[PDB]
Subunit: 308 residues, 4 copies
């Protein structure tokens, strides 16, 4: 099986804390936080480890927070390839409210990258051998021009690196600008922004996904639909996969779990149907767990057997 | 096509109001409320009218609020058959918050019913002709023992009335104890309570629905699954229908819209597939509208054509 | 001691209910409500009963909800004088959320009054003997022109009825338009709207209250200041009374409790200082109780002894 | 006038961000944060600068966040004396919600301190000259036994350093076990915990404060009462000062502003009355500003002149 790498230009060291109630104005006293790795490509690599594969996370790390992020990944046996950055690795906050069981997630931008740190990141990307898979996932941090992202993807593709993209906004449009992306996973809002129109008719999501494939921007578009599962589109096929009717506990990590699973199937040269089913299995398996926990192998396997 | 009736033991006159912000402790200044008909069977009858059918809503009404409830339905050209009750028709509250666009729904019990009044409602039901359809939908109000609900449904079936049930808790178990219910529509929570186990495995919902059909409790069970659509089960068939991937504006009225649609299909002697498809079409069409608005005919048709393509 | 009456043109039959959590979109299942009398003058009369006095509540009542409102007051031994109205007595909602201990209060307008029902209400007001006290408190319902309120107050004053006013907005301005009001109790926001300017300097509240007295609109202005107590102003005196440093549990009914207490002191021809102190004692005593419960005699007495 | 120092065992580099709405489950997109100095003693020193005085903030700083904390204070011309700590300076989060204008404050513990680092902080404190003032303010970080806080304050007093304490829980009890504290500023909750009883009667707060003075634990106790101002107690005097009736915009920084003000008055050997008046003036001036902004000189002066009229 081909090697798998992920790229996260905006990683984070996330804090998970607990407080008894939520209300404005006053000080909410929060428990000592539990630190967890954060960022699109980093979580894709973690999900892949859970599913029994291996993926190397490429990312910039800065300061004590960056060192702790790398430390956490080592304890999870997730291989990494890091670039030391000047700006310190930023922190997002996950707050669990005990009285209500609700969770609040505050997502701020990643640390800045200068031109030289991005150059070093691109250097690590181009050390990846031909045929191997690269998952570019997450937001675009300050300090990086959009064209630099497109140029990185072009350079990767020129030497046979197979690129998978999961992002949003201008970053997503830019990653698809040159085209020939192997797989892209917009959710519904992300798809709507990408094709720049509202998707209000029953057939709109399918047609918008097909329009992306037909343009040559992506060979495979998997539109993820939250509890409705996903719609996968090829030049030859359109497949909708709906999760089993089991209550979601928490949706955190659903997208990254789905992406890790589909990446593994892509690495196996699986059918589109098998890929999307395994993606829905993993994304929905992720929901079965409280808080930030990612998909487990056993839950994904069980849901996949049901979908099959 | 047969006549359709609905029964709502706990109707309400609902107030819908607007306020700029929501926070505790202080007085939230709310706009003069707009009043709307409330209650399971009442809303099923309203959805049926939106879909071009006709259904008579049977319910207790009391006091000035009850009079207004009745007046509102006449304005909507929904036929009613009412029993005057001693306890005044109760009110639920729907609050739209301007700053967030969020809606809050405070659902309180229906007015009390005494034994005489329930017997009067029973009398109305038994005036329904054989072969007609009766949809019993909504909560059980104070004053009514569960054994009386069982007796009403049993009495109604004795003379060829085809009963459809949508309820929850002990009222749903009581309504199904008789058996031979034409159709029951539990959502996932209601199904879990009905079979008294958590449904945590992928096939649990289907197996639970089949268990109800196989035991003889219901001829058809449609488990509605929110954005996932519905799973319909017969002695012969099992199907899941998922709605198209369109954004839900508001979920209020989804269940009652779905039940109204399935009831119309049942009246037409439709297949299980056609019935569940029309049900999901109507339920999901309801979601396309803001606030409490029920499914519209055109939106339901558009989704159904898609599901039928 | 002189007789005391209250007038409530917009009464309500309030529902108090409990639900385990609060969140939007879904159905919040609420317990069978406990019904309680509502409306400014009605609650002033209830507070007066708690403090050991007697006040007759004048108000319109309509439908089964109106009958239950009258029924509740009878069980509280609060004497009433009612006018049967066509429009049914409206309902406000008090929601207690079990998980957080928070309470949410949704206040909607009162029922409409037609010209003839208002005429009957005015008739009951003018049956009040000279020297007796009338507390006009609460919002103005639909169907009643502002001038009708001012004309009612004028007619009352012409036959020696001593008027106390607690209201807001255009209704408050109108009640003060003719002047010679015995006592008015705006809170800070209400004062600001009345004098039509923002009160941002340390001395502004005092000066605004004094400006009302000096204009002849009111003989006594007591500006209530929430946890800061109240500032009472006369032609000869300015007195600030601050409550004791005890935690407030719920603020519901604080204003009406204060008004009932000050009304009783006014009926006793008490000093301004004694009046304001007893008002703060009752308002703050009200806060000591959870939910909607009004001031108790024993708590008010205890706080009054402290203030003295 | 004597030199003023502050000690913050649990400093922070706080992030202030903005988001349009607050709701659970979904990702809330927050703006790139503005960083601000955090911590009790640190904020006391900042308020002192706003009021025209000078105070040296002593604290542990670690990692890049600690470097930024130090850099921010230098930009504000607040003198510091720091100990480099192994554990990186922690971050609290202040979230402004645009739709409601509300602010949410998530307060997490400070970075850990080992025994060596605390001894280094102790060394800094004992370099303070006799007769100077030290304000110990804020929470106790992980890694520090309560007996070490008691020892530091005892050691500091042994050589004429005048200690002012603002803290909570066991750290406050520990800080007062020594006795002869120049000034303590509990709020109502902190006072209740300190004397270990609910303060439910009108005179309970005054009696509790007097009990602390009379036992010798503190020379002055100022119980701060939020919008009700403060009650100040001496062996000789007892006074309550209530702020003017002006609307509070935001309460963040009220306590630290009040402590900074009272500290400056203590340095000037002011009367209890003048000290508490200036304290309430500064605390209430702080409330006049949005978000985290501390008291300003002019607003504090205006309120103080009013209180002094
Ligand atoms: N359970 C609650 N629900 C809603 N608001 C609350 C709640 N608890 C506190 N608040 C709000 O927070 C403000 C202050 O709360 P609190 O008593 O915790 O003081 P604080 O300043 O946050 O903390 P501290 O005791 O450390 O000084 C109150 O004025 C109130 O507005
Ligand atoms: N409420 C849910 N119930 C069941 N499965 C879910 C639910 N939400 C997400 N999933 C599963 O997770 C997959 C991906 O989630 P989703 O479509 O929300 O993508 P996403 O918005 O990119 O995720 P994320 O917010 O984590 O980045 C879905 O296709 C589905 O399989
Ligand atoms: N916009 C708001 N956001 C959060 N809390 C608020 C807001 N407005 C008011 N509150 C809370 O409600 C309490 C009272 O608010 P408000 O000024 O509206 O007084 P009120 O008693 O509700 O109304 P009224 O002016 O009729 O007396 C405040 O002390 C505050 O805690
Ligand atoms: N979020 C949604 N998106 C799309 N369709 C929906 C959504 N929620 C409900 N529906 C549609 O409405 C039908 C019924 O809704 P649901 O399964 O939630 O039943 P319910 O809980 O009984 O409704 P209710 O709460 O109104 O009584 C669904 O099967 C589906 O067709
Ligand atoms: N504890 C909660 N916190 C936040 N939101 C919730 C919570 N519980 C339910 N909701 C919201 O309410 C919606 C539906 O909740 P629920 O399962 O109670 O169904 P319902 O339509 O309100 O009632 P029913 O079971 O009678 O059909 C959910 O989609 C969710 O958005
Ligand atoms: N948080 C509080 N703590 C202590 N006492 C209070 C508090 N709030 C109100 N009071 C007491 O109640 C009196 C009146 O309350 P307030 O100034 O809020 O008037 P109000 O806004 O007209 O009341 P309401 O909202 O009930 O109509 C105050 O003067 C004070 O004595
Ligand atoms: N404006 C809102 N009000 C209340 N709840 C919301 C709101 N927006 C989103 N939610 C809740 O958060 C969940 C996800 O919202 P959203 O569309 O932002 O997806 P997301 O996972 O947070 O972000 P993303 O697009 O990056 O995947 C929704 O299912 C809904 O329950
Ligand atoms: N809502 C308010 N209105 C007016 N002044 C206030 C208000 N809150 C606080 N203050 C002023 O600030 C001083 C200190 O505030 P407080 O009594 O709340 O102390 P604290 O709880 O220790 O503050 P903090 O939460 O910041 O640590 C008060 O004595 C008072 O002067
Ligand atoms: Cs999860
Ligand atoms: Cs709707
Ligand atoms: Cs109360
Ligand atoms: Cs502030
Ligand atoms: Mg995603
Ligand atoms: Mg998402
Ligand atoms: Mg339902
Ligand atoms: Mg539902
Ligand atoms: Mg008031
Ligand atoms: Mg008020
Ligand atoms: Mg404090
Ligand atoms: Mg405080």
């Amino acid at each position: 099986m081909v090697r798998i790498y992920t790229l996260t230009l905006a990683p984070s060291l996330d804090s998970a804390t607990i407080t008894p109630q939520i209300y404005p104005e006053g000080k909410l006293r929060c428990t000592a936080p539990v630190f967890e790795p954060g960022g699109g490509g980093i979580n894709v690599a973690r999900a892949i480890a859970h599913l029994g594969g291996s993926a190397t996370a490429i990312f910039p790390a800065g300061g004590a927070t960056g060192e702790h992020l790398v430390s956490l990944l080592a304890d999870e046996n997730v291989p990494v390839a890091t670039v030391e950055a000047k700006d310190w690795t930023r922190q997002n906050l996950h707050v669990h409210v005990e009285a209500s069981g609700e969770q609040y997630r505050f997502v701020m931008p990643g640390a800045a990258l200068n031109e030289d740190e991005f150059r070093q990141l691109e250097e690590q990307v181009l050390e990846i051998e031909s045929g191997a898979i690269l998952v570019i996932s997450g937001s675009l941090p300050p300090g990086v021009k959009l064209e630099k992202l497109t140029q990185l993807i072009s350079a990767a593709q020129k030497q046979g690196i197979r690129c998978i993209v999961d992002s949003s906004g201008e970053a997503l449009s830019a990653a698809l600008a040159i085209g020939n992306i192997e797989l892209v996973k917009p959710n519904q809002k992300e798809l709507s922004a990408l094709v720049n129109r509202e998707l209000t008719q029953p057939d709109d999501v399918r047609k918008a996904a097909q329009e992306i494939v037909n343009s040559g921007k992506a060979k495979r578009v998997v539109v993820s639909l939250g509890p409705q599962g996903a719609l996968g589109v090829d030049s030859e096929n359109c497949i909708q996969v709906v999760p089993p009717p089991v209550k979601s506990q928490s949706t955190v990590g659903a997208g990254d779990s789905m992406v890790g699973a589909m990446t593994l199937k892509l690495a196996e040269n699986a059918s589109l149907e098998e890929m999307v089913r395994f993606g829905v299995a993993a994304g929905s398996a992720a929901t079965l767990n409280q808080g930030t926990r990612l998909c487990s192998h056993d839950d994904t396997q069980k849901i996949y057997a049901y979908l099959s």
